[PDB]
Nucleic acid binder design. Structure first.
Length: 1301
RNA sequence: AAGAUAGCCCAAGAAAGAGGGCAAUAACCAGAUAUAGCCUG
C-alpha cells in the first residue's frame, strides 16, 4: 500500500472540504501534512521502489522451468532497469525520468511517437546513446544475458500470465512484451499493430518512474470527500467534485445532472417517477441492444420497464463468444480468463461509443433532456459492466449472455439511486433532526441542519456514527434474545401472537367486546401461572436465593406474578428501537423500585459467587486459604472495566501448552509432588492454576503500573541492541510511548493491533504481543504472588468454611447500587443482559468495550489532526449513562448467568421431572417405569471392566448438570433433539477406555508421539459428548446464525428509514406539489404542537421507541397523538392514517420504494423479518437456516449490493470460526410473491446449498510435538454431521457423501 | 428470482482510462462465560 505510513481523512472548514494525510500516532502540530509535505511524502513513497523494480514478480517440471527463466531475467546483468538507467554515475537519471514524463504526456495529448531525448535536456549525441539504452536491441541483450535455453510461444504466454507485474497487465503492454520476448528468443512472431518501443518499453519507463501516480495521487487525495455535504442554502445533497481539469469538469457536470435527477425523482406523483425510470430504461436498452431495438422505435411508447427487464433476462443472445475450453491446466485457464476479460472490455468499449453516439443523435424524447444526465448514466453502465468482468472468478456461459448483463446493469443503476437516497437520509437523520430531542417546545422544525454541521461533515464525524450504529444494532440483537429467553418458559405463543414483547397486561380487554379479554392479553398465553414466579427466578439464579426478598412489598394491592412478568417484559421492550442518538427515556413505566431492589439483592451475592468459583475450581486444594483470601481481595475489591483489543488470557496462555509452560524452569518451575487419585489431582491442579491465572490476568495484571514499565523495556530489547520483526515491533513501541507517555498497557496493545489489522475468514506484531505479555505476566506472578510457586495438595475444606469473612473487606458495588436505583436506563441494561446466555452476555460486554475504544480512537485522531469535532458521541457515556456503570452491570450478568443453582428444585419440580428431562439428551435405558430409578440403575451399572457408568448421579439424587440447565434456560430443546443424537452407553464405554489409555500422559500438555496426540484429541471429543459440551457448542452456533439474521434485520430497518428520510427530504426541497400536512402539522389537541417538516418527523417517529406520532384515529375519526411507545407495526398503521388524506399518492409510506425493493414482495419481506425476530424457526422448523439465509440473499438486501453480496461469505465465516469449512453451491428454490389473507404466487428463488459430495470438511489443527508436527482434524465426522443437520433440517441429505475426510 | 466472495469516494478517461483512498461501509482482525472445547501462525 502506497500510504502505509499514514492515514487519510476528510475535513471541512467553511463548506469546503480537503482530504488530508496524517501520521498516526502523532501529536498536534506533527500529524497533519501540509500541501508540500503531502506532495513529497507521496513522491518519496514512489521513489522507494525503483531499485527493486522488476518486470516479473517473485513441484512440477514445467512450472519450475518457468520460475528459472523469470529469475535469470531478473538477476544482475539482466533486465534490471535501475542498473540500466543509472549508468555512467547516474548522469542520465534525470533525462530518463523526463523521457518517461513526456512519453505519458504524449499519450494524454494524443501526440504519436516516442519523445526525442533532445527535448529532455540532452545533446544529440548523448540522445542517441540514451535511445539505444532503452531500445529493443538493448532490452533483448539484457533479457538474453542470463538465459541460454530454448523457449516457445506457450512458455512465454505462461510466464506473462503468471509473473508479469500488475501495473503492466494491460493488453497492448502485454502484447508488446510478448513481441519483444519472441524476438529475443529468435522465434517467428507477428503482431503488426503493436510497437515494442511505444507499447512496452516506453510504458515500462512510465511505470518505473511512476509518472501517473507522481502527477495525480496527491491531488486525488486532496479532492476526496464524503458522500453528502451541505450546499449554499443549508441543504444536504450528494457531494459534487470541484473538478479543475477538462475531464474533471465534465465529470462534475455529469454528477450535478444526477443530483438534479435525485431532486426531480422525489415526486409523490408516480407518473413522474414512472416516466423518468422509462428514460433510464431506454438508456440500458440502447447500450446493450443498439438504437434500432423495438423498444426505442416509438418515442411515446409507455412500455412497462419491469416487464422489459424480465424479458431481456431470458434472452439467449451472446455478449461475447467464449473461447473453447482447455484440454486442470491452471496456467492455461488463467490465460483463457485473461482473454475472456479482454473480450468483455473490447465489447464494452464498443457498446459505450455506440451509446454515446446514439444519445447525441437519436434522442428526441427517448432519453433525458439533459445530455449530461444521459452521459452520467452511460458512464455508470460502462462501469457496471467492468465491475462484472474485472473480478471474474470463472468463465461461465450465463455471465456472457447480453440479457444477464443488461439486467445486472439495470439493477445496478437502481442500486445507485437507492444508496444515494439512503446516504442523504443518513446525513439528515444524524445532523438535521435535532429537535427530535425531547423538549418543551410547542413548535419545532425538522430538516434544518444543526449549527455545528452547516460548515460540512468530516470523516471523523462518520466514524462516530458508525460506532454508535454498530452498538445500537448489536444491542438490538440481545434485546431480542432476552425477550426470547424470558418467554421460553413463561408463555406459549401462537402464529398470530408471536411477539412476546407485544403482549398486553392482564387487564386488557377486547376493543369490540369489552366483556372478553383482548386476544393479545398475556393471560391467554401463560404456561403455568401458579409456578410463574419460580419460573422467572430460574433466570435470577433459582428461587431458593430469593426466600428473603419481600416480593409482596413491591407486588401489593391486586398485583401478582403476572404483573411481575409484565414488568420484566416492559423493561426489555423499552430498549427495543431505543435510539442512542435522540433521547425521547429515563422514566420507565415498570416498577422501578422492584427492579432496583432485585439488582441490589443480586450485588449482595457477588463476593460469595466469586469466592465460590475459587473453591469450585479447587484452588483451596493446593493453596492456603489465607493466601487465597489475599488474592480474592486484590482481584475483586474494585470492579474492573476491561479494555478491548487486549489479547485474551487464553491466547497468551494456551490451555494445551499450559502444564508444560508452568513446569518450565525459565518460566515458573512449578512442580506438584503427589496413589489412585494421582493423575486426577494433577489435572485438578492445572485446571485450578489456569482459572486463577486468568482472573489475575484481567483483574490485577493488565492495569499494574510496574507491569507496563517492564513490558515496554522488554518489548524494545531487540530494538536497542523473527529477528527482523522484533526490531520493527520494538521501534513501533518506542514511537507510541514517545507520542504519549501516559498510554496504558491496553492502549499500547490497541495501537499495535490497529496497524496489524479481506471479507472472508481465512482457512488453513500479534505474536510479539503475546510473547511479551506472557513474559511480563510470569514475572508479575513471581513478584507479587510468590505463594503460587509452592502448591501443596491437601484436603478440601467445607465450602462454607472457605474465607467466610470475604464480604467484610470489599464493597465494589456500593456506588452502583444507588445509581441503578435512580436510572431507568441502567435497569434496561441490567434486565436485557441478565436474560442472556453466559456466552451472549460476554459478547455484549465485548461489544461495549469495542464501542468505547472506537470512540476514544476517533477523538484521539481528530485531536492530533486539529480537526474540530462535535462531541454528541461521548467517550464516557451512552444514552446519558456512564459506560463504566453499564460495564459493571453487564459484567454482573455475565458472572451470574453462568452461576447455576445447586438445587434441582430451582429448575425442576422433583427428581423425576429432572430425570425425564435428561432423557431427551441421554439414553440411560429407560425401562418404562420412573425415569429417576432408570437413571440411577444406569449410573450404577458396569461401563468398562472395573468402572461403572457414574457421571450422572450425585448420591440420592440425579447430578445437576450445568450444560443441561443452561440449555433449558437459554437453548432450544426441540432444535437440539432434531440435530443431535442422544448420549449412549457405547459413547460412555469409549469415553472410559480413552480415559484409561491417556491416563499416563494426560497432563504432558504437549506430547511425544503422533498416536498420543490423536488419542488425546479423541478423548477430548468424547468428554465433550458425555458432558453435553457439544450440546452447548451447537446452541452457540445456532445463536450466532440467528443473531446475525437479527443484526441484518436492524441494518435493513435503519436503511429503510434513511431511504424514506432522504427521499422525502428531497421531495420537501423540490418544487413538486406538496399538501399542507406533508409540510406542516398544526396539532390542536390538549398536547398541542406545531411540526414544521412534518413528513420527516413522522418518518422518524415510526422507528424510535418513545417518539409520539400524529394521526387520525380509526374509531374517533379525529386527530390525536400517541405516547410514542406503540409497536413499529402500530406506528406504520398510524403513519398511513396521517398520510391517508394525501391526494397525489395512494401510499406515501411506499413512495419511491420501487428503488429500495420489489413492491410486490413487500409483505413477504415483513413476513421474513417477523419469522426471524419472533424465533418461529424453533417452533415450526418449516425452513432451514440455509433456506432463511437463502431468502435473505435473494431479496432482503435489494437496496444495497454491498450488503447482499456479502451474505454468503458472512455465513461461511461463522462456520469457519468453529473450524467447519463448507463449499457453497448456488441453485434454485422457491419463494412466494404476496401473502394470502389469496393472491400469492410462487416464483423461483435463490437457494444457497452445500456441494453434494465433499462439501463439508474440518479445519486441521497444527499440533506441535517435541520433534515433529502432526495435523489432526479439529472436528470429527460426528460433529460435522450435527453441523450439517443444523444447516439443513428439516431437509435431509447424504452426509456420508457430503463430508470429506 | 439466483449462480455470491464486495461496494462507494477521489483521480483518470474515447485511438478509452485503469492511479489512489475507506474503522467514512459492511465484512475482516480482536474479545474467555465454568473445571482437558478456539490449535497453528
Amino acid at each position: 500500500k502506497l500510504t502505509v505510513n499514514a492515514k487519510t481523512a476528510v475535513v471541512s472548514e467553511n463548506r469546503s472540504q480537503e482530504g488530508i494525510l496524517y501520521n498516526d500516532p502523532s501529536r498536534y502540530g506533527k500529524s497533519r501534512k501540509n500541501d508540500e509535505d503531502r506532495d513529497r511524502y507521496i513522491e518519496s513513497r514512489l521513489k522507494s521502489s525503483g531499485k527493486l523494480y522488476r518486470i516479473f514478480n517473485e513441484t512440477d517440471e514445467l512450472q519450475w522451468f518457468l520460475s528459472e527463466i523469470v529469475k535469470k531475467i531478473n538477476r544482475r546483468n539482466g533486465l534490471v532497469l535501475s542498473d540500466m538507467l543509472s549508468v555512467d554515475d547516474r548522469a542520465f537519471e534525470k533525462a530518463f525520468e523526463k523521457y518517461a514524463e513526456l512519453s505519458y504526456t504524449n499519450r494524454r495529448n494524443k501526440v504519436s511517437g516516442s519523445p526525442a531525448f533532445e527535448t529532455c535536456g540532452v545533446d544529440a549525441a548523448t540522445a542517441e546513446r540514451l535511445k539505444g539504452i532503452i531500445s529493443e536491441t538493448n532490452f533483448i541483450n539484457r533479457i538474453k544475458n542470463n538465459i541460454d535455453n530454448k523457449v516457445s510461444e506457450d512458455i512465454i504466454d505462461r510466464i506473462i500470465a503468471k509473473y508479469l507485474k500488475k501495473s503492466l497487465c494491460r493488453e497492448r503492454v502485454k502484447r508488446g512484451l510478448k513481441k519483444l520476448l519472441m524476438n529475443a528468443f529468435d522465434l517467428p512472431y507477428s503482431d503488426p499493430d503493436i510497437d515494442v518501443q511505444r507499447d512496452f518499453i516506453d510504458y515500462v519507463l512510465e511505470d518505473f518512474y511512476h509518472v501517473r501516480a507522481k502527477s495525480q495521487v496527491s491531488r486525488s487525495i486532496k479532492n476526496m470527500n464524503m458522500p453528502v455535504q451541505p450546499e449554499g442554502d443549508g441543504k444536504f445533497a450528494i457531494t459534487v467534485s470541484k473538478g479543475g481539469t477538462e475531464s474533471g469538469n465534465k465529470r462534475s457536470a455529469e454528477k450535478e445532472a444526477f443530483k438534479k435527477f435525485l431532486s426531480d425523482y422525489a415526486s409523490l406523483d408516480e407518473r413522474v417517477r414512472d416516466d423518468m425510470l422509462r428514460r433510464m430504461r431506454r438508456l440500458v436498452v440502447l447500450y446493450f441492444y443498439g438504437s434500432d431495438d423495438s423498444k426505442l422505435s416509438d418515442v411515446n411508447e409507455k412500455f412497462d420497464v419491469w416487464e422489459d427487464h424480465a424479458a431481456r433476462r431470458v434472452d439467449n443472445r451472446e455478449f461475447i463468444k467464449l473461447p473453447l475450453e482447455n484440454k486442470t491446466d491452471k496456467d492455461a485457464e488463467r490465460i483463457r480468463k485473461n482473454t475472456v476479460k479482454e473480450l468483455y472490455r473490447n465489447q464494452n468499449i464498443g457498446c459505450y461509443r455506440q451509446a454515446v453516439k446514439a444519445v447525441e443523435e437519436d434522442n428526441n424524447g427517448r432519453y433525458f433532456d439533459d445530455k449530461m444526465l444521459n452521459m452520467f448514466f452511460i458512464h455508470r453502465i460502462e462501469y457496471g459492466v467492468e465491475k462484472i468482468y474485472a473480478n471474474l472468478k470463472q468463465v461461465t456461459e450465463f455471465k456472457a449472455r447480453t440479457g444477464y448483463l443488461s439486467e445486472k446493469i439495470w439493477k445496478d443503476l437502481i442500486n445507485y439511486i437507492s444508496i444515494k437516497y439512503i446516504a442523504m437520509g443518513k446525513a439528515v437523520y444524524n445532523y438535521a433532526m435535532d429537535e427530535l430531542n425531547a423538549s418543551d417546545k410547542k413548535e419545532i422544525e425538522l430538516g434544518k441542519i444543526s449549527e455545528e454541521y452547516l460548515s460540512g461533515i468530516s470523516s471523523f464525524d462518520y466514524e462516530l456514527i458508525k460506532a454508535e450504529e454498530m452498538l445500537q444494532r448489536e444491542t438490538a440483537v440481545y434485546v431480542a434474545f432476552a425477550a426470547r429467553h424470558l418467554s421460553s418458559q413463561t408463555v406459549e405463543l401462537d402464529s398470530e401472537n408471536s411477539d412476546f414483547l407485544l403482549l398486553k397486561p392482564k387487564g386488557t380487554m377486547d376493543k369490540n367486546d369489552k366483556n372478553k379479554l383482548a386476544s393479545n392479553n398475556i393471560l391467554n398465553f401463560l404456561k403455568d401461572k401458579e409456578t410463574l414466579r419460580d419460573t422467572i427466578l430460574q433466570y435470577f439464579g433459582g428461587h431458593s436465593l430469593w426466600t428473603d426478598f419481600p416480593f409482596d412489598k413491591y407486588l401489593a394491592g391486586g398485583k401478582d406474578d403476572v404483573d411481575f412478568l409484565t414488568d420484566l417484559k416492559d423493561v426489555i421492550y423499552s430498549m427495543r428501537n431505543d435510539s442512542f442518538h435522540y433521547a425521547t427515556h429515563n422514566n420507565g413505566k415498570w416498577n422501578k423500585e422492584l427492579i432496583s431492589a432485585m439488582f441490589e439483592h443480586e450485588t449482595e451475592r457477588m463476593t460469595v459467587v466469586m469466592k465460590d468459583k475459587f473453591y469450585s475450581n479447587n484452588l483451596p486444594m493446593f493453596y492456603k486459604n489465607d493466601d487465597l483470601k489475599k488474592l480474592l481481595i486484590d482481584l475483586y475489591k474494585d470492579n474492573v472495566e476491561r479494555a478491548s483489543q487486549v489479547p485474551s488470557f487464553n491466547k497468551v496462555f494456551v490451555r494445551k501448552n499450559f502444564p508444560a509452560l508452568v513446569r518450565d524452569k525459565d518460566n515458573l518451575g512449578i512442580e506438584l509432588d503427589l496413589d489412585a487419585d494421582k493423575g486426577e489431582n494433577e489435572l485438578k491442579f492445572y485446571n485450578a492454576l489456569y482459572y486463577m491465572f486468568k482472573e489475575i490476568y484481567y483483574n490485577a495484571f493488565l492495569n499494574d503500573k510496574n507491569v507496563r514499565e517492564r513490558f515496554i523495556t522488554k518489548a524494545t530489547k531487540v530494538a536497542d541492541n523473527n529477528y527482523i520483526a522484533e526490531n520493527d515491533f520494538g521501534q513501533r513501541i518506542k514511537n507510541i510511548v514517545q507520542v504519549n507517555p501516559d498510554y496504558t498497557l491496553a492502549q499500547i496493545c490497541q495501537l499495535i493491533m490497529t496497524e496489524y489489522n479481506c471479507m472472508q475468514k481465512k482457512s488453513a506484531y500479534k505474536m510479539l504481543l503475546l510473547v511479551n505479555l506472557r513474559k511480563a505476566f510470569l514475572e508479575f506472578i513471581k513478584e507479587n504472588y510468590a505463594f503460587v510457586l509452592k502448591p501443596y495438595k491437601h484436603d478440601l475444606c467445607d465450602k462454607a468454611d472457605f474465607v467466610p469473612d470475604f464480604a467484610k473487606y470489599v464493597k465494589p458495588y456500593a456506588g452502583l447500587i444507588s445509581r441503578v436505583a435512580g436510572s431507568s436506563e441502567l435497569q434496561k441494561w441490567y434486565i436485557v443482559s441478565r436474560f442472556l446466555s453466559p456466552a451472549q452476555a460476554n459478547h455484549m460486554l465485548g461489544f461495549l468495550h469495542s464501542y468505547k475504544q472506537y470512540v476514544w480512537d476517533i477523538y484521539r485522531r481528530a485531536s492530533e489532526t486539529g480537526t474540530e469535532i462535535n462531541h454528541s458521541i461521548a467517550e464516557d457515556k451512552i444514552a446519558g449513562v456512564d459506560i463504566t456503570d453499564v460495564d459493571a452491570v453487564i459484567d454482573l450478568s455475565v458472572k451470574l448467568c453462568g452461576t447455576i443453582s445447586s438445587e434441582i428444585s430451582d429448575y425442576f419440580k422433583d427428581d423425576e421431572v429432572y430425570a425425564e428431562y435428561i432423557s431427551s439428551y441421554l439414553d440411560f435405558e429407560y425401562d418404562g417405569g420412573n425415569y429417576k430409578d432408570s437413571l440411577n440403575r444406569f449410573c450404577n451399572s458396569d461401563a468398562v471392566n472395573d468402572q461403572k457408568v457414574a457421571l450422572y448421579y450425585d448420591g440420592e439424587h440425579p447430578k445437576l448438570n450445568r450444560n443441561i440447565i443452561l440449555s433449558k434456560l437459554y437453548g432450544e430443546r426441540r432444535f437440539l433433539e432434531k440435530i443431535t443424537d442422544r448420549v449412549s452407553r457405547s459413547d460412555i464405554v469409549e469415553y472410559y477406555k480413552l480415559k484409561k489409555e491417556t491416563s499416563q500422559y494426560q497432563t504432558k500438555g504437549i506430547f511425544d508421539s503422533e498416536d498420543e496426540q490423536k488419542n488425546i484429541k479423541k478423548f477430548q471429543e468424547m468428554k465433550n459428548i458425555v458432558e453435553f459440551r457439544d450440546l452447548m457448542d451447537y446452541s452457540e452456533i445456532a445463536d450466532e446464525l440467528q443473531g446475525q439474521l437479527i443484526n441484518w434485520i436492524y441494518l435493513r430497518e435503519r436503511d429503510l428509514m434513511n431511504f424514506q428520510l432522504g427521499y422525502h427530504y428531497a421531495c420537501l426541497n423540490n418544487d413538486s406539489n406538496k399538501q399542507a400536512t406533508y409540510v406542516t402539522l398544526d396539532y390542536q389537541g390538549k398536547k398541542n404542537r406545531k411540526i414544521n417538516g412534518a413528513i420527516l418527523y413522522q418518518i422518524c417517529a415510526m422507528y424510535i421507541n418513545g417518539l409520539p406520532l400524529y394521526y387520525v384515529d380509526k374509531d374517533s375519526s379525529e386527530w390525536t397523538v400517541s405516547d410514542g411507545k406503540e409497536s413499529t407495526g402500530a406506528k406504520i398503521g398510524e403513519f398511513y392514517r396521517y398520510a391517508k388524506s394525501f391526494e397525489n399518492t395512494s401510499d406515501c409510506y411506499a413512495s419511491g420504494l420501487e428503488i429500495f425493493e420489489n413492491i410486490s414482495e413487500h409483505d413477504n419481506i415483513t413476513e421474513l423479518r417477523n419469522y426471524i425476530e419472533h424465533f418461529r424457526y424453533y417452533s415450526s422448523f418449516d425452513r432451514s437456516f440455509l433456506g432463511i439465509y437463502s431468502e435473505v440473499f435473494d431479496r432482503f438486501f435489494t437496496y444495497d449490493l454491498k450488503y447482499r453480496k456479502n451474505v454468503p461469505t458472512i455465513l461461511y465465516n461463522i462456520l469457519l470460526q468453529h473450524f467447519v469449512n463448507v463449499r457453497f453451491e448456488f441453485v434454485s428454490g422457491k419463494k412466494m410473491i404476496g401473502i394470502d389473507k389469496k393472491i400469492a404466487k410462487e416464483k423461483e428463488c435463490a437457494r444457497i446449498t452445500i456441494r453434494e459430495k465433499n462439501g463439508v470438511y474440518s479445519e486441521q489443527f497444527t499440533y506441535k510435538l517435541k520433534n515433529g508436527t502432526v495435523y489432526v482434524d479439529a472436528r470429527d465426522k460426528r460433529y460435522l454431521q450435527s453441523i450439517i443437520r443444523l444447516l439443513f433440517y428439516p431437509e435431509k441429505v447424504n452426509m456420508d457423501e457430503m463430508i470429506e475426510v
